Design a protein around this nucleic acid. Structure first.
Ligand SMILES: [Mg+2]
Ligand SMILES: [Mg+2]
Ligand SMILES: [Mg+2]
Ligand SMILES: [Mg+2]
Ligand SMILES: [Mg+2]
Ligand SMILES: [Mg+2]
Ligand SMILES: [Mg+2]
Ligand SMILES: [Mg+2]
Ligand SMILES: [Mg+2]
Ligand SMILES: [Mg+2]
Ligand SMILES: [Mg+2]
Ligand SMILES: [Mg+2]
Ligand SMILES: [Mg+2]
Ligand SMILES: [Mg+2]
Ligand SMILES: [Mg+2]
Ligand SMILES: [Mg+2]
Ligand SMILES: [Zn+2]
Lengths: 102, 219, 96, 220, 59, 129, 130, 25, 87
RNA sequence: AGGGGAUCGAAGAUGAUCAGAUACCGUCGUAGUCUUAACCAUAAACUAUGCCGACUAGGGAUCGGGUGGUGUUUUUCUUAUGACCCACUCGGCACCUUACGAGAAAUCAAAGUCUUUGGGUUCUGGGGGGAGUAUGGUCGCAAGGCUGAAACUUAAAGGAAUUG
RNA sequence: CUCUAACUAUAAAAAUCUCUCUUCUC
C-alpha cells in the first residue's frame, strides 16, 4: 500500500528529474528524492581556534567557513544516521527537528 | 420583543470598547462569522460590538430559562479566563470547571466529577474542544465565547469577542452574569451598574498576586 | 457516469460488449467452444462403459495417508484410457 | 430477584420516580440512555435471542488468549429493537453484557403499509437500507402476509421487531453475522429517519421531560 | 461459581477456585474462577488467605 | 460538455439539499427544468423558485423547505408504455403511497399519477419523492 | 533506589491536608504524631510516612506546592482572589479620560447611535516585517 | 524466481527453438 | 400513519430540526433543543414561559448552528438586526 | 552504417572474500555511453487513479495574468515604470484540517454527489497456475513488439489491517 | 510585547533446519 502519499520523491507534476550521485556510495538517485544536507562549518574547529588566533599574522583575521551541499543516497542516509525511521503518525511532520539550538 | 431598556447603554458600550473587545479579532477570518465590520487597515478586523451585546443578552435569555441554576456549567481551560468563571459561578448559581476539564466528565457516569448539566458555557472552542465533544455526545447546548478565528463546530449561540486579552474575557463574563442576574430578578433594576467591579473577573498572575500581597503587608 | 454507454441508440455496442465479455466465464466458454465433445473423455456423457486394463492403487495427498484402490479403464465408446475409482471398502476384489 | 437500582443518571432518577411513563418520551427528545434498568422499567417484556457466539483470539507470546463475542438481539415484537455485541472472557458473562448493551441500545421503528391501510401496520413504511463493513442490507415493503423474506438472522431480527411482512436483499460478505445484523439494524432504525408526506406538518416542540421535571432529578 | 458466590456471600474479601484436569476433553486444561482480590506475597498470604487442595475421582 | 441539463439541475438540487441549504442556483434553465420544478411545486417537494433572465438561456434560483429528499433524472429518456409505468414506480419510488415518476407525455410534462389519470404515457424524465 | 511508593506519598498527603496545624518541622515530633493520629500497621512504614511528611512540610514552608491543599492555604488563596482594586482600571480613569481608537471603530461607535469620547488615530497600515 | 528472469529463460528457450527452425527452414 | 378508521398507529411523531426541517432521529446524540426565556416589560424573565428551537445534530456538526439560531431568533423578534438575509 | 573516442563502464582480464565466488569490495577494460541518417515501440512509460461536464468544506500559502488601492520604499527635481505591501479574481503544480460523505480498510476534497442505484463516452477484468506459453496472423534486418487459447492441475492464490 | 548562528567524524565474515495443531456451551 502507499506508505507515502508523496511517494517520497516530492515531484508532483514533472514526470522526470535529473538524477544526482550519492556522496558516500555514488547511487544515481533523483535530485528530489535524494536527501540534501547543507554542511556549513568552520574551516578550523574550536579545537584549534585559540592556537590559530595566537599563531596568525593579520590580527583579527576573520577565518573563513567551508560550505558543501551533500547529496546523500537514501540507504546511506538511513545507515549514516542522517535520517531516521519515524512513527507512522510522525511521518506527517515535515518541519526540521525544531531548531537544534537557539 | 425586548423592551428598549435592553439596548446598548452608553456606559456598557464604553466598557466593551475599553476592554479592547472589538480591537482584536484576527489577521485572518473564517466565513462562519459575519460578525466582522470594517476590516482595519492594520489587518486586525474589528468586531461589531452591538452584535456582541445582542449575543450576550440572547445567551442571558437562554441561561435564565433554565429552571434549576446549577445545570449551567461553565468551562475554562486556558488561564486568562479561569478566575472569571469561578467568580461567575459565585454570583449566578452555576457550576464551574477551571483548569483541566477531565475527559469523560459528561459521558462517563462513574467519574466523581460526572456533571450532567442542561447547558455548557465555554471560554474558547479551540482550547476546550474536549468539553465541546463531550457536550456533543450527550445533547448539550454550547454557549461559547468564540472569536472571529475560533472554530464553530458543535457550537450553539456564540458571543463574538476577543480571546487574546484578559480584559475582554473578564468583562464579557461580567456582562453575562450581570444580565443573567437582572433576568432572574435578584438585581432589582437594570440601570444601576451593580457596584461590584469588572476587575473582579480579570486574570491575576501569581507574580502580581505576590506583589499585591507584598504591597499589602508593607504596613 | 459508468464505463458502459447509456444512450437510447447504443444497443449495438452494449450487446457486442456483453457478447465479448461472456467469454471470460468458464461455463459459457466450454458450452460454446464445445470442448466437452472434443477433449473430455466423454462427450457430454454422464456415464460410459469401458474395459478394465489393469488394477492399480493410488496414494493420497499430504494431509491424508492411505492408498485409494483405483482401476485403469479403456473406454469402449472412443478408446480413451482413464483411471477410475472403486468406491467402497471391499469392492476392489469384486471387479476383476 | 434482588435489585435496588440506585439511579445515577437524571433520566434514571426520573424513570425511578415514575415521572416518565412511556419510552416514546425518551425516543422523542433524543435522550441519552445509560442505565439498562430504564429500558427494563419501560418495556417489561423485552425478549431476546443469542444470534451467535464467536471465539476471537489474540496472539500473545504465550499461547493464544481467547475471548468470546456474543451477538444478542433484544426486542418486544411491537416496534422496539436493540442489537448488543459484546466480547468477554466467559461465554455467560459475554451474553449477559451483550443483552445489557442491547437493552441500552433499544431503538424505535416505523412500521407502515404496503398498499391500502386496513388494520395495524404489517410492513415497513418505505424502502430502507444500511451498510456495515461491506454488508449492505436493503429492506423493501411487502404485501400482507408475505412473511419475512430474509436470512435466518435478519428474519429473527424482524420477528423481534414486530415487522411481520418484509422483503430483503443483502449484498457483500453477509457471511459475517455481526456486520449483517448491524446493517439490518441501521436500516430498521433508519425507517424513522425518512421524511414522508404524512410526516410533513410541524409540531409545537413539547418541552423536554427533564426540563419540566428537573426538580425530581438532582438527588439532594 | 456457586461456591465462589456462597463464599463471597459469607463476607470474604475474595475467593478463587482452580479446577484442573480433563474437563470434558482428553487434553488437560485448567479453569480459573475468581472474584474479589487475592494477594500472593508476604505472610498476608499466611495471615489472611487460606487454601485447600483436593483430588476428585471421575470415570 | 453539458449533455443533459436537467441532470445538472437535479444534481445541484440534491447537493444543496443534502447539505441542508434552502436555495440553489441552476445555471442553464431550459423549459424542461421549469416544468420539472413546477410539478415539484404542485406536489410541494419544492418551495418558491425564480427565473432570472440573462438573454443567455437564463438562470433559476430555487427555494427549498427541506421537504424534498431526492430528485434524479433517468438520463436515457426511455419510451415508457402505459404498462411499464408501474414497473418504473416499483423500481424507483420507495413506497406506493407517495413519490412521483415525472414523465413527459404528448400532453406535457406530468407526474406519473396524473399521466395514468389521463390514460396517456410517453417518455420518462425523472423521479421525485 | 529510594522512591517512596504510592502508599507513603498518599498517606503523607492526606496527613498534611487533614492535620497541617499540628504538624511540625521536626521528624521525631511528626513521628509521634503519625503514631497517635494514624494507625500505621508496621513501624518501618510509619517511619517512611513521617519522613515524607516532614519533607512535604519543608517544601510547603519554602512555598506553595501543587497537589496538596489545606484549610489555611485555601483560605489564603480565596482572600487573595477576593482582591478588587478600589481605583478603576477602566472607564478612562487613565489617559486623561481619553481612549485611543482608529477610524473604523469610531464609525462603529457612530453607526451604533452612541456618542462616546473618542480619539481618532490612523493605524499605519504598513505592517512590521517581524 | 522473478518475472524478469522467467521471461529471460523463456527468451533463451525461444533462442534455441528459433535457431533450430532456421537451420531446418 | 393513519389507520382507515382514522386512529393513529405511529409510535410517535418525531421532532424536526427547526432550521432545516429535517426530522430528529431517536438516537441522534448530537442534536439540541434551545430554550429562550420570554421577557416582560421590566426585564424579568417570566418563569415557565419560553420559546424552544430544536437544532439538528447535522448543522451543529457542520458548523452552522449559531448562524441558524441567529436567523431563527431574529425572525421571531428576539435579536435586532443580528442576521442579514443577504450576505 | 559514417563521425568522433574524455569520463564511466555489459562482456572480458585479473587482485581479494569465501567451503566454493568466473557475485558484491578493487584495478584495467572492448561494445555502449556522445552524435548524423535509418530502425526499434517496449518501462514500476506510476498519480499503479481515462477523458469532457456540473455541484458539494473550511485554511493558508505558491506560479502566470488582470483589476483596485489617497499604501511602502525606491529617484530622474515630482511623477512613469519596476520592486514590494493589502484586497479581489481567473487558470496551474500542489498542500493542511475535518467527516458531515465514500471505502474491506491503508486512505480519498476526490477514490464524494452509488441499493435514495441512470450527465456523455472509450478501454479493460471474471479464482490461482499453465501463460502473456503454443499455434495462426501481422510488424521488424535482428532483437522482439501487437493479437493471443486450450488440454491439464488446483482450494485457494491475493488485498488492507490487528496482536505476537 | 520586537528576533536567522553553530558545527563534523563507524560500513570485515555468518550457509542450512525432519514431525504436530487439538470442543466452546449459561
Ligand atoms: Mg512495504
Ligand atoms: Mg524524501
Ligand atoms: Mg503539467
Ligand atoms: Mg500487593
Ligand atoms: Mg514483596
Ligand atoms: Mg559506430
Ligand atoms: Mg567479473
Ligand atoms: Mg576471482
Ligand atoms: Mg566491479
Ligand atoms: Mg576505469
Ligand atoms: Mg506494458
Ligand atoms: Mg498501467
Ligand atoms: Mg483466471
Ligand atoms: Mg499472469
Ligand atoms: Mg508468431
Ligand atoms: Mg499483506
Ligand atoms: Zn548512498
Amino acid at each position: 500500500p502507499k506508505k507515502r502519499a508523496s511517494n517520497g520523491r516530492n515531484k508532483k507534476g514533472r514526470g522526470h528529474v535529473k538524477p544526482v550521485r550519492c556522496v558516500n556510495c555514488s547511487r544515481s538517485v533523483p535530485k528530489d528524492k535524494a536527501i540534501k544536507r547543507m554542511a556549513i562549518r568552520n574551516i578550523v574547529e574550536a579545537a584549534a581556534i585559540r592556537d590559530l588566533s595566537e599563531a596568525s599574522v593579520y590580527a583579527e583575521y576573520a577565518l573563513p567557513k567551508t560550505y558543501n551541499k551533500l547529496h546523500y543516497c537514501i540507504s546511506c542516509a538511513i545507515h549514516a544516521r542522517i535520517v531516521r525511521v519515524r512513527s507512522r503518525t510522525d511521518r506527517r511532520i515535515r518541519a526540521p527537528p525544531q531548531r537544534p539550538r537557539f | 420583543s425586548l423592551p428598549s431598556t435592553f439596548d446598548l447603554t452608553s456606559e456598557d458600550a464604553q466598557l466593551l470598547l475599553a476592554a479592547r473587545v472589538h480591537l482584536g479579532a484576527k489577521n485572518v477570518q473564517v466565513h462562519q462569522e459575519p460578525y466582522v465590520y470594517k476590516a482595519r487597515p492594520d489587518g486586525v478586523n474589528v468586531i461589531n460590538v452591538g452584535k456582541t451585546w445582542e449575543k450576550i443578552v440572547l445567551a442571558a435569555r437562554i441561561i435564565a430559562a433554565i429552571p434549576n441554576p446549577e445545570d449551567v456549567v461553565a468551562i475554562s481551560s486556558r488561564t486568562y479566563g479561569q478566575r472569571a468563571v469561578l467568580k461567575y459561578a459565585a454570583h449566578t448559581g452555576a457550576t464551574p470547571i477551571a483548569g483541566r476539564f477531565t475527559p469523560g466528565s459528561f459521558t462517563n457516569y462513574i467519574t466523581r466529577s460526572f456533571k450532567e448539566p442542561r447547558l455548557v458555557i465555554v471560554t474558547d472552542p479551540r482550547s476546550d474542544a474536549q468539553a465541546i465533544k463531550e457536550s456533543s455526545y450527550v445533547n448539550i447546548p454550547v454557549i461559547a465565547l468564540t472569536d472571529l478565528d475560533s472554530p464553530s463546530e458543535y457550537v450553539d449561540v456564540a458571543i463574538p469577542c476577543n480571546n487574546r486579552g484578559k480584559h475582554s474575557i473578564g468583562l464579557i463574563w461580567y456582562l453575562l452574569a450581570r444580565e443573567v442576574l437582572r433576568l432572574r430578578g435578584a438585581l432589582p433594576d437594570r440601570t444601576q451598574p451593580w457596584a461590584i467591579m469588572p476587575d473582579l473577573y480579570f486574570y491575576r498572575n501569581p507574580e502580581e498576586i505576590e506583589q499585591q500581597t507584598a504591597e499589602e503587608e508593607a504596613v | 457516469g459508468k464505463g458502459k454507454p447509456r444512450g437510447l441508440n447504443s444497443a449495438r455496442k452494449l450487446r457486442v460488449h456483453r457478447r465479448n465479455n461472456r467469454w471470460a466465464e468458464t461455463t459459457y466458454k466450454k458450452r460454446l467452444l464445445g470442448t466437452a465433445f472434443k477433449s473430455s473423455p466423454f462427450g457430454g456423457s454422464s456415464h460410459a462403459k469401458g474395459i478394465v486394463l489393469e488394477k492399480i492403487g493410488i496414494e493420497s495427498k499430504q494431509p491424508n495417508s492411505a492408498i485409494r484402490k483405483c482401476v485403469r479403464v479403456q473406454l469402449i465408446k472412443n478408446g480413451k484410457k482413464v483411471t477410475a475409482f472403486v468406491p467402497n471398502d471391499g469392492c476392489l476384489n469384486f471387479v476383476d | 430477584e434482588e435489585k435496588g437500582w440506585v439511579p445515577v443518571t437524571k433520566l434514571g432518577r426520573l424513570v425511578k420516580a415514575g415521572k416518565i411513563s412511556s419510552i416514546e418520551e425518551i425516543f422523542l427528545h433524543s435522550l441519552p440512555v445509560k442505565e439498562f434498568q430504564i429500558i427494563d422499567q419501560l418495556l417489561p417484556n423485552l425478549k431476546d435471542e443469542v444470534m451467535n457466539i464467536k471465539p476471537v483470539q489474540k496472539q500473545t507470546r504465550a499461547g493464544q488468549r481467547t475471548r468470546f463475542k456474543a451477538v444478542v438481539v433484544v426486542g418486544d415484537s411491537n416496534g422496539h429493537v436493540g442489537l448488543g455485541i459484546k466480547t468477554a472472557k466467559e461465554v455467560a458473562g459475554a451474553i449477559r453484557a451483550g443483552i445489557i448493551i442491547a437493552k441500552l441500545s433499544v431503538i424505535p421503528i416505523r412500521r407502515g403499509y404496503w398498499g391500502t391501510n386496513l388494520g395495524q401496520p404489517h410492513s415497513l413504511a418505505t424502502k430502507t437500507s444500511g451498510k456495515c463493513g461491506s454488508v449492505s442490507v436493503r429492506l423493501i415493503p411487502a404485501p400482507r402476509g408475505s412473511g419475512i423474506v430474509a436470512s435466518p438472522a435478519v428474519k429473527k431480527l424482524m420477528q423481534l421487531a414486530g415487522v411481520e411482512d418484509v422483503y430483503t436483499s443483502s449484498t457483500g460478505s453477509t457471511r459475517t453475522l455481526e456486520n449483517t445484523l448491524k446493517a439490518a439494524f441501521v436500516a430498521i432504525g433508519n425507517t424513522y429517519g425518512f421524511l414522508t408526506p404524512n410526516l410533513w406538518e410541524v409540531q409545537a416542540l413539547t418541552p423536554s421531560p427533564m426540563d419540566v421535571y428537573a426538580d425530581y432529578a438532582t438527588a439532594s | 461459581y456457586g461456591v465462589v458466590r456462597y463464599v463471597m456471600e459469607s463476607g470474604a474479601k475474595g475467593c478463587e477456585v482452580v479446577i484442573s484436569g480433563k474437563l470434558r476433553a482428553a487434553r488437560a486444561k485448567s479453569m480459573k474462577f475468581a472474584d474479589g482480590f487475592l494477594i500472593h506475597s508476604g505472610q498476608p498470604v499466611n495471615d489472611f488467605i487460606e487454601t485447600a487442595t483436593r483430588h476428585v475421582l471421575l470415570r | 460538455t453539458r449533455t443533459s441539463v436537467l441532470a445538472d439541475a437535479l444534481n445541484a438540487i440534491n447537493n444543496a439539499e443534502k447539505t441542508g441549504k434552502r436555495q440553489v442556483l441552476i445555471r442553464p434553465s431550459s423549459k424542461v427544468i421549469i416544468k420539472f420544478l413546477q410539478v415539484m411545486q404542485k406536489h410541494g417537494y419544492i418551495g418558491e423558485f425564480e427565473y432570472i433572465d440573462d438573454h443567455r438561456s437564463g438562470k433559476i434560483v430555487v427555494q427549498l423547505n427541506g421537504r424534498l429528499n431526492k430528485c434524479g433524472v433517468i438520463s436515457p429518456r426511455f419510451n415508457v408504455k402505459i404498462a411499464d409505468v408501474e414497473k418504473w414506480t416499483a423500481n424507483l419510488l420507495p413506497a406506493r403511497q407517495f413519490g412521483y415518476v415525472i414523465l413527459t407525455t404528448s400532453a406535457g410534462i406530468m407526474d406519473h399519477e396524473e399521466a395514468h389519470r389521463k390514460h396517456v404515457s410517453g417518455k420518462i424524465l425523472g423521479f421525485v419523492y | 533506589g529510594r522512591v517512596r511508593t504510592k502508599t507513603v506519598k498518599r498517606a503523607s498527603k492526606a496527613l498534611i491536608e487533614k492535620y497541617y496545624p499540628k504538624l511540625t518541622m521536626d521528624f521525631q515530633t511528626n513521628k509521634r504524631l503519625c503514631d497517635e493520629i494514624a494507625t500505621i500497621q508496621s513501624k518501618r512504614l510509619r517511619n517512611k510516612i513521617a519522613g515524607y511528611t516532614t519533607h512535604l512540610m519543608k517544601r510547603i514552608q519554602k512555598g506553595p506546592v501543587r497537589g496538596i491543599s489545606f484549610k489555611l492555604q485555601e483560605e489564603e488563596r480565596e482572600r487573595k482572589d477576593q482582591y478588587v482594586p478600589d481605583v478603576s482600571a477602566l472607564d478612562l480613569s487613565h489617559s486623561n479620560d481619553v481612549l485611543n481608537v482608529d477610524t473604523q471603530t469610531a464609525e462603529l461607535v457612530n453607526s451604533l447611535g452612541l456618542k462616546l469620547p473618542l480619539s481618532v488615530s490612523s493605524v499605519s497600515a504598513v505592517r512590521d516585517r517581524r | 524466481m522473478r518475472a524478469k528472469w522467467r521471461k529471460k529463460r523463456t527468451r533463451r528457450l525461444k533462442r534455441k527453438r528459433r535457431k533450430v527452425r532456421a537451420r531446418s527452414k | 400513519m393513519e389507520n382507515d378508521k382514522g386512529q393513529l398507529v405511529e409510535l410517535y411523531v418525531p421532532r424536526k430540526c427547526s432550521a432545516t426541517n429535517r426530522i430528529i432521529k431517536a438516537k441522534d446524540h448530537s442534536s439540541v433543543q434551545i430554550n429562550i426565556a420570554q421577557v416582560d416589560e421590566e426585564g424579568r424573565a417570566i418563569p415557565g414561559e419560553y420559546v424552544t428551537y430544536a437544532l439538528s445534530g447535522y448543522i451543529r456538526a457542520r458548523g452552522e448552528a449559531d448562524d441558524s439560531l441567529n436567523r431563527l431568533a431574529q425572525q421571531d423578534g428576539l435579536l435586532k438586526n443580528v442576521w442579514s438575509y443577504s450576505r
